[PDB]
């Protein structure tokens, strides 16, 4: 159960996020590391011990 950490489209009422490509954060084409870019999907640690 992950979540859209980043995305390159402003959300509006009653709209869904689908694109999961690397969130480009630099003027140069940003793919992965280097600039501020990171994978916009972080795992939630759904443990019963939390």
């Amino acid at each position: 159960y992950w979540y859209r950490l980043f995305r390159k489209s402003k959300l509006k009422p009653f709209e869904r996020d689908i694109s999961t490509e690397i969130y480009q954060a630099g003027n140069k084409p940003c793919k992965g590391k280097g600039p501020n870019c990171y994978f916009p999907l972080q795992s939630y640690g759904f443990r019963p011990t939390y």
């Binding site: 954060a25 590391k33 280097g34 600039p35 501020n36």
Partner: protein
Amino acid sequence: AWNRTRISNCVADYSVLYNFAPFFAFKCYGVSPTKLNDLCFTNVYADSF
């Protein structure tokens, strides 16, 4: 023991330094300025890690 980097009574234009070093973990949770020159604020509580 973070540094008291008190950013007051000046223009907090630190966005140019983005080009000086390759900032990797750029997590701006409340405000994400690629440029920062207008608002005056009292307390900054800036930290160095």
